[PDB]
Write a protein that binds this ligand. Structure first.
Ligand SMILES: CO[C@H]1/C=C/O[C@@]2(C)Oc3c(C)c(O)c4c(O)c(c(C=O)c(O)c4c3C2=O)NC(=O)/C(C)=C/C=C\[C@H](C)[C@H](O)[C@@H](C)[C@@H](O)[C@@H](C)[C@H](OC(C)=O)[C@@H]1C
Ligand SMILES: CO[C@H]1/C=C/O[C@@]2(C)Oc3c(C)c(O)c4c(O)c(c(C=O)c(O)c4c3C2=O)NC(=O)/C(C)=C\C=C\[C@H](C)[C@H](O)[C@@H](C)[C@@H](O)[C@@H](C)[C@H](OC(C)=O)[C@@H]1C
Ligand SMILES: CCCCCCCCCCCCCCCCCCCC(=O)O[C@H](COC(=O)CCCCCCCCCCCCCC)COP(=O)(O)OCCN
Ligand SMILES: CCCCCCCCCCCCCCCCCCCC(=O)O[C@H](COC(=O)CCCCCCCCCCCCCC)COP(=O)(O)OCCN
Ligand SMILES: CCCCCCCCCCCCO[C@@H]1O[C@H](CO)[C@@H](O[C@H]2O[C@H](CO)[C@@H](O)[C@H](O)[C@H]2O)[C@H](O)[C@H]1O
Ligand SMILES: CCCCCCCCCCCCO[C@@H]1O[C@H](CO)[C@@H](O[C@H]2O[C@H](CO)[C@@H](O)[C@H](O)[C@H]2O)[C@H](O)[C@H]1O
Ligand SMILES: CCCCCCCCCCCCO[C@@H]1O[C@H](CO)[C@@H](O[C@H]2O[C@H](CO)[C@@H](O)[C@H](O)[C@H]2O)[C@H](O)[C@H]1O
Ligand SMILES: CCCCCC
Lengths: 1023, 153, 192, 48, 48, 48, 48, 48
């Protein structure tokens, strides 16, 4: 094939153009995102029950839905929350590779058939079935600075004007409104209602009657009286459109003939559907939009289009309204792409410098400058073909790949320049011979590198999805590098390179290049003299090798483990947790203290504080709040002191002072959708109808045992709420029936007044919206206000609530968890310093076995993923090694020689481990792939050294040591040229990527050139 | 400070921690938002040792929540016979009425704790004590249909 | 429940059948309306048809018929399933000690085993060889007439007294300024 | 083109004064001029 | 009485049922025991 | 039933159309709100 | 119709490039392709 | 796929005759099938 394209350089050029056009076309049409779909498909069933407690929600909604989630394909597990905010969220996680659309519609369909089994109030509100993912493209915050608008006022505008326009914007997937639009709030007065002998039942009956869409019919409708001239539609009652109209809702007419209207017994205003969430952006009332990226969309174009549309909305905004961007993933994808193009150009620049420094002719320096871009563009085309996207994982996979692409370029050209310099052949004949020597190895190197990278794409779940991005990218880039090295760069060499006279090593030159040639020819002689001495005393160096393999193995284990590291993302949360029974006013004051702190003490680092009262990651009680702290640019925060890690600890340390509040800052995970932070996600399950109280005892019993193992388990806590005091009220059925007061009227009065009742819909300025009847704050606060509410008897007398009720305090769960349709309690925890998660999990299984009868357990999330994916690792390492060996066996026609190459693996690794150990880095995915590329390039060097060595022994009939010394001599220059390009040069990921190679190369280069010849001689002597 | 720590320890049943807190001088009159002292919580959750330890450390046995319910109400209602006895020995008001006029006998009769009912009667519980609806522990037993309880009252 | 073959056919089967239209790769449709109250409409598709889409299409049409069906039939839960007509296997459950009766065993399997098996991927349909427990109110007409009550009154009382009420919260949102207490209000709960 | 609509207004107070419920008004008006789908019947063994 | 979903693999599905029943057995009441009176999958395994 | 185009559009068409975000290969979306009461929101997708 | 016409120019452009590159590879020349591709206008005018 | 010799016949009510008439038609057909043992064997209804 090289011979074919050496005679046909125009064909070789056509293939290069077809690859470049395919690549250029791919770059434009390819999707762009921070991370691809890594987490397994999850479908969350969300519902709302106004004024309902954790148990009411669970025992009427959650259990009913969970029972009807059958006949759904590829379901791994099911988790559900039921809390006292009147919320339920049932997350159904599916097998990795499941059609998320098919998964959702099957969940959606089985729910719709279970809707008649839910309460009327839940059916009316509706149950949402959405694709579970918190991987937002950006959060567009909407704030009011002049204090003319409340959080309700903003939310309503964002919904009615902006939300639909952002939905329309090119490349936008899903858009969540951070708040609710207006609702017709009827704030009832029990003193007024009692005065006129009325109840909330009468208010609801009147609103349902006087705010409705009535179907009237038609004038001259078919069948008509023949001769009819007109056919008009009849309009009767329509929905009310104003607080005025609702004001005049007629409840009662008295004896004297006076009208009792809704405005007489209730305050009426356009308020919010929900008052549980209070969101603030630097102390100012705020709403927002949670924008997601659409499937196969460009994040950079979408973000620009969103900002472009928001700019067109600028003129229509009310006075004081501003648009802010507390969260945005766009800047990361810009850097990820920018720093690939930088490395790509720097590589080409540095190769040129090294190529010219050694070969000393500009015509040779252009061959890599053509080849590298062609292959890189080719990679973009193969990514598009396999349906991959431009993301961090695929981009940093290419950064690592450039090393392999640069080598293939230097290897082919240098070997031609040498063959010309040593024999004196014309370029075309020199290229033929040159390629003839390496063409076999290049094909072999492809299969070996394939056998290294391909297997990790066959990992299962989230871990496999991540490795797949690097695997396909590097294999594609590498595979095309060999194709270009066998088709294009040979043809370029045979046409572009100039004749070099036999024995012209450029020592006869003057100046720097004349000196360098004499200097390097000495160094090459001193090198062969050194290797000559090494091969006299092999046994000693084999002992030094075992010290490195021992050093490697030890230094590998001692280095801390992770998947994706915790980096400065310019954002971090601050949880605010007040004690059981604490109000949102008390919580807001702590949130204000948290907001004040960040804007006062961290004014240099903090940009904004999005203080969300009554919220965590989901809607929480009044006693909870979270603060999404958005930082300034990394250019405005120099030093490790002004990074999230230090800012987090400083904040947490300062907030230890706050009384009656567990306030602590913590960093965002790299991919939140998984929450992978090392450690486990343990589920404790009630398997024998033990109840909530018995499951609480078993949890405390497990948490107690875990606390007696600091050596194994650290920070083993529950991801749930403790039982809070709640107001039990018992309606006496006998006293109710005796007075002639119906329980329906009683439970409606209590439910509507204290809980709030969603009556029906009205039309505010052309938008359909909810009507809510509820008690005015001051009549539904304390237990004494219970007796202020009156229910009308059959006889017409108004009976107070104190007459037929009797209340006491008790304890109940404000958030009841279930796993696989059984009452559960999620327990988080991690392995202790110098311990694996596998060990920590095995103890949690041991401790869990000693718990009471009927108390089971299970692993979910990262635990489930790590549990299954971990079992695959040994099988993939086996295939990787077995196939690498088999490939080299076919290449060298020997079962023995392959070992000489495979023994180089530790020489590549040891450097990276030393670099990581002393810089204090982790064994993250970026680093692990960094080792595979370091091992790959190390193997590539050794493969060509051994091939040349064995070829000299086979073809020219040279001795073992002669052939070895002659081989390592020929291969010194191209290995040093590749290595020098790294030494010259060619941000947590950038460190993991750069340091996952730099340290490796600095040593691997020095170790390989001296140890590869040892391995070959030692192995050849043995067999 | 340590009062909010004792309330959690009393509720959880951490005997060792309560003991350590009693030494440090944790406030035994420390209540939550509803007025439940650690004795209330210990009596509610059935932690006998903590109930004894708290009473030793000068805890109020006749302490009442914001609705008038004492620890004996909770202990009697949730079937903690040992705690009911310990409280009554340390001078618990057996005829104590909450805001509904309900007594430990009413509550014990309702859940049908025959053993506890006998203990309350032994310490002089007014069997003819009526709630806000004029109903006795007997009127409860006939409504629940408890044959054994009906005979005792 | 309690319907004859014709009542079932005329109020459900026909109403559902009439909505089954514009469904791709449908070969034929067969229904059975019997005096147990049970309807079973099998829609058989061409070989190669995506059973996922066939189910999605069939239910899309059923959901148009759902509101026209009696409230008793909807509250029993209508099921759309894409399974074989034969049984893959039978998972029998016995009590060797003889501590639990046929009825006690059936209830346990229904409450503790059935659901998890029904969610298992590949399981098209699970059929309990027994019945899950219900609160059986066995009425006496002599005692009902005696106190001048009907099954109507019995049903009215149960829905009214066996209720799970959403009663709101103390110090709920929006609250008054200076509110210190926030507690869930717990009224009537389901009878156990 | 925009069509004419015969808007009939029900006086809520005047109805309450005379003792007629607006449910009976809305149904009488609705059923008369528009028609009302009450329930099904069997015509030669078919639901209509 | 378990029925196989359309297209689903009998042996794979049967294996998943046994795996899920294995998680239940430990928390059975005293006396309760699983029996396998009808299975079409063993023939497929053995005959193959 | 018995709702003019405007009532139909505000309470039905707008409510459906606003939730028609995040659908793959959507070229355009046209809807009719009639004085019959009917709505018909047609979503036309990319060829293929 | 708009789409058909808007993509027609780039269709002709890539079609010419592909045919040109195919001749360059087959005949191992830059002259034969260019000498040939110059005929295209002589045909196109005929169709027009 | 069914049995070797077996067939699956469906007698249809096309004109809304009713159940009683369709029964008479079925009973008649079964009797005529019984008079042809040479061709048809075990012709029976799959119902109640
Ligand atoms: C590891 O992950 C962390 C952040 C993810 O980053 C975010 C953006 O993504 C989250 C996801 C995917 C969750 O599932 C969360 C969650 O379940 C929470 C809370 C909290 O609000 C969260 O805050 C998140 C949360 C995030 O902010 N728990 C609750 O709401 C409940 C019912 C908590 C009950 C008790 C406490 C308060 C909680 O157990 C606490 C002791 C810690 O375990 C957490 C605060 C973890 O922090 C750490 C490591 O100290 C986060 C889960
Ligand atoms: C040819 O087919 C056979 C096997 C199919 O293989 C199976 C696995 O698939 C079946 C299908 C797709 C059905 O539709 C069935 C059916 O409709 C039945 C019965 C009945 O149990 C069945 O048993 C099946 C049945 C199967 O076992 N009839 C009924 O339930 C009703 C409501 C009344 C029964 C009427 C009589 C008593 C029945 O007709 C009888 C006279 C025979 O004709 C059948 C028992 C056939 O036995 C044989 C070997 O002559 C089977 C249909
Ligand atoms: C979607 C995926 C894309 C798939 C693309 C597939 C395209 C299919 C192409 C089919 C090729 C036909 C088979 C090869 C031709 C051999 C016989 C030709 C006749 C002959 O006498 O041989 C010479 C060929 O040169 C020789 O002695 C051998 C050289 C053969 C050159 C092959 C040219 C193929 C170019 C394809 C372009 C696309 C590249 C994409 C990878 C002629 O030529 P000559 O020597 O007389 O020359 C002019 C000198 N004055
Ligand atoms: C839809 C819109 C998309 C727009 C995007 C851009 C599209 C790009 C399209 C690509 C077009 C290809 C252009 C080919 C360039 C031809 C160069 C002219 C060469 C020439 O005429 O001289 C020949 C000699 O060449 C020699 O001396 C031997 C050849 C060695 C040099 C070849 C260098 C080619 C470099 C190509 C780079 C293109 C990059 C594009 C990304 C003479 O002919 P002859 O003597 O050989 O023939 C007779 C043999 N007896
Ligand atoms: C035995 C065969 C050698 C015969 C020829 C030897 C000398 C060649 C004389 C050429 C005239 C210029 O002389 C050349 O100048 C270059 C400047 O770039 C110098 O080259 C080098 O010298 C200095 C040290 O002095 C180095 O640190 C530096 O890397 C480089 O500049 C040398 O001094 C000489 O190689
Ligand atoms: C701490 C990181 C790990 C360290 C890795 C060290 C390996 C890289 C350095 C290799 C340098 C090679 O250095 C080479 O050593 C050998 C002996 O070992 C010397 O050889 C010496 O011993 C041989 C064997 O008896 C004698 O025949 C020879 O006369 C004597 O010089 C070479 O003259 C020297 O050039
Ligand atoms: C399923 C996957 C199986 C493949 C895995 C093995 C991968 C390793 C491939 C080994 C590299 C090729 O190995 C090398 O190929 C060249 C040709 O390119 C051979 O050389 C051969 O050239 C030509 C073309 O095949 C032959 O007509 C000629 O007889 C022979 O000299 C070398 O003798 C061989 O050593
Ligand atoms: C030996 C002919 C090779 C051609 C590959 C395109």
């Amino acid at each position: 094939m090289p011979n074919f394209f050496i005679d046909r350089p125009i064909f070789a050029w056509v293939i290069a153009i077809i690859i470049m056009l395919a690549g250029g076309l791919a770059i434009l049409k390819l999707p762009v995102a921070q991370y691809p779909t890594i987490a397994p498909p999850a479908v969350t069933i969300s519902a709302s029950y106004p004024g309902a407690d954790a148990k009411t929600v669970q025992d009427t909604v959650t259990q009913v839905i969970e029972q009807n989630m059958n006949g759904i394909d590829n379901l791994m597990y099911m988790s559900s929350n039921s809390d006292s905010t009147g919320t339920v969220q049932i997350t159904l996680t599916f097998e990795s590779g499941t059609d998320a659309d098919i998964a959702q519609v099957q969940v959606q369909n089985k729910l719709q058939l279970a809707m008649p089994l839910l309460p009327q109030e839940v059916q009316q509100q509706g149950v949402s079935v959405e694709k579970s993912s918190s991987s937002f493209l950006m959060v567009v915050g909407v704030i009011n600075t002049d204090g003319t608008m409340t959080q309700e006022d903003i939310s309503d505008y964002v919904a009615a004007n902006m939300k639909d326009a952002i939905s329309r914007t090119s490349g936008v997937g899903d858009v969540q409104l951070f708040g609710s639009q207006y609702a017709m709030r009827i704030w009832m007065n029990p003193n007024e209602l009692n005065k006129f002998q009325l109840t909330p039942v009468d208010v609801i009956t009147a609103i349902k009657a006087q705010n409705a869409q009535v179907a009237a019919g038609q004038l001259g409708g078919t069948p008509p009286v023949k001769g009819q001239q007109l056919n008009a539609s009849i309009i009767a009652q329509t929905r009310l459109t104003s607080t005025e109209e609702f004001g005049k809702i007629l409840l009662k007419v008295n004896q004297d003939g006076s009208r009792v209207l809704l405005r007489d017994v209730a305050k009426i205003e356009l308020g919010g559907e929900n008052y549980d969430i209070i969101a603030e952006f630097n102390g100012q009332p705020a709403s927002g939009l949670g924008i997601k990226l659409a499937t196969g969309a460009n994040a950079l174009d979408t973000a620009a289009a969103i900002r472009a549309e928001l700019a067109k909305m600028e003129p229509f905004f009310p006075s004081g309204l501003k648009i802010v961007y507390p969260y945005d993933t766009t800047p990361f994808v810009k850097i990820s792409i920018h720093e690939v193009v930088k490395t790509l150009v720097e590589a080409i620049i540095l190769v040129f410098l090294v190529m010219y420094l050694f070969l000393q002719n500009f015509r040779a320096t252009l061959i890599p400058t053509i080849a590298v871009p062609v292959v890189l563009l080719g990679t973009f085309a193969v990514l598009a073909a396999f349906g991959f996207s431009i993301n961090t994982l695929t981009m940093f996979g290419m950064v690592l790949a450039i090393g392999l692409l640069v080598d293939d370029a230097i290897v082919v050209v240098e070997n031609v320049e040498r063959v010309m310099a040593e024999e004196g052949l014309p370029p075309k004949e020199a290229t033929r011979k040159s390629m003839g020597q390496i063409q076999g190895a290049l094909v072999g190197i492809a299969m070996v590198l394939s056998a290294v990278f391909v297997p990790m794409a066959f990992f299962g779940g989230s871990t496999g999805a991540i490795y797949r991005q690097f695997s396909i990218t590097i294999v594609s880039a590498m595979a095309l590098s060999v194709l270009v090295a066998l088709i294009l760069t040979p043809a370029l060499c045979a046409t572009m390179l100039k004749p070099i006279a036999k024995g012209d090593h450029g020592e006869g030159k003057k100046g720097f290049f004349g000196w360098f040639n004499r200097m390097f020819e000495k160094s090459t002689h001193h090198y062969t003299d050194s290797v000559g001495g090494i091969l006299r005393s092999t046994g000693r160096y084999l002992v030094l090798y075992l010290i490195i393999v021992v050093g490697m193995a030890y230094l590998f284990v001692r280095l801390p483990s992770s998947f994706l590291p915790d980096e400065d993302q310019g954002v971090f949360m601050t949880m605010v947790q007040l004690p059981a029974g604490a109000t949102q006013e008390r919580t807001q004051k702590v949130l204000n203290e948290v907001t004040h702190y960040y804007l006062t003490k961290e004014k240099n680092n903090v940009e904004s504080v999005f203080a969300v009262n009554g919220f965590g990651f989901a809607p929480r009680g009044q006693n909870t709040g979270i603060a999404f702290v958005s930082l300034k640019d990394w250019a405005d925060r120099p030093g490790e002191e002004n990074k999230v890690e230090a800012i987090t600890m400083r904040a947490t340390r300062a907030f230890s002072q706050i009384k009656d509040a567990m306030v602590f800052a913590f960093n965002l995970p790299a991919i939140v959708e998984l929450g992978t932070a090392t450690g486990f996600d343990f589920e404790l399950i009630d398997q024998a109808g033990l109840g909530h109280e018995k499951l609480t005892q078993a949890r405390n019993q497990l948490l107690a045992e875990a606390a007696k193992h600091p050596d194994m388990l650290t920070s083993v806590r529950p991801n749930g709420l403790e039982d809070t005091p709640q107001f039990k009220i018992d309606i006496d059925q006998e006293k109710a029936q005796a007075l002639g007061v119906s329980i329906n009227d009683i439970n409606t009065t209590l439910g509507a007044a204290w809980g709030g009742s969603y009556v029906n819909d009205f039309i505010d300025r052309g938008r359909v919206k909810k009507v809510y009847v509820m008690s005015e704050a001051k009549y539904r606060m304390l237990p004494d206000d219970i007796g202020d509410w009156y229910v009308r008897a059959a006889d017409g007398q108004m009976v107070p609530f104190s007459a037929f009720s009797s209340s006491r305090w008790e304890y109940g769960s404000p958030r009841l968890e279930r796993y696989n349709g059984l009452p559960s309690m999620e327990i988080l925890g991690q392995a202790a310093p110098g311990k694996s998660t596998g060990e920590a999990m095995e103890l949690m299984e041991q401790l869990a076995s000693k718990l009471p009868t009927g108390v089971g357990y299970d692993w979910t999330g990262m635990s489930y993923q790590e549990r299954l994916s971990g079992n695959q690792a040994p099988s993939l390492y086996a295939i990787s090694l077995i196939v690498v060996f088999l490939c080299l066996a076919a290449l060298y026609e020997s079962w023995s020689i392959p070992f000489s190459v495979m023994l180089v693996v530790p020489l590549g690794v040891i450097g990276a481990l030393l670099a990581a150990t002393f810089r204090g880095l982790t064994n993250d995915v970026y680093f692990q792939v960094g080792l595979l590329t370091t091992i790959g390039l190390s193997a590539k060097n050794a493969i060509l050294i051994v091939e040349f060595a064995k070829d000299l022994m086979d073809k020219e009939g040279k001795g073992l040591i002669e052939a070895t010394l002659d081989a390592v001599r020929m291969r010194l220059r191209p290995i040093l040229m590749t290595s020098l390009a790294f030494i010259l040069g060619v941000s947590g990921a950038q460190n993991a990527v750069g340091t996952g190679v730099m340290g490796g190369m600095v040593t691997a280069t020095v170790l390989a050139i001296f140890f590869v010849p040892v391995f070959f001689v030692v192995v050849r002597r043995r067999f | 400070d340590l009062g909010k720590k004792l309330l959690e320890a009393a509720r959880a049943g951490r005997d060792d921690e309560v003991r350590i807190l009693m030494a440090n001088g944790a406030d035994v009159n420390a209540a939550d938002v509803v007025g439940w002292t650690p004795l209330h919580l210990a009596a509610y959750w059935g932690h006998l040792e903590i109930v004894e330890v708290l009473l030793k450390n000068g805890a109020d046995v006749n302490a009442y929540d914001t609705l008038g319910s004492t620890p004996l109400h909770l202990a009697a209602h949730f079937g903690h016979l040992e705690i009911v006895e310990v409280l009554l020995k340390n001078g618990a008001d057996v005829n104590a009425k909450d805001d509904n006029g309900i007594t430990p006998l009413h509550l014990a009769a309702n859940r049908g704790h025959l053993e506890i009912v006998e203990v309350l009667l032994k310490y002089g519980a007014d069997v003819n004590a009526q709630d806000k609806f004029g109903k006795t522990a007997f009127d409860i037993s006939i409504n629940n249909g408890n044959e054994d309880l009906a005979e005792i009252l």
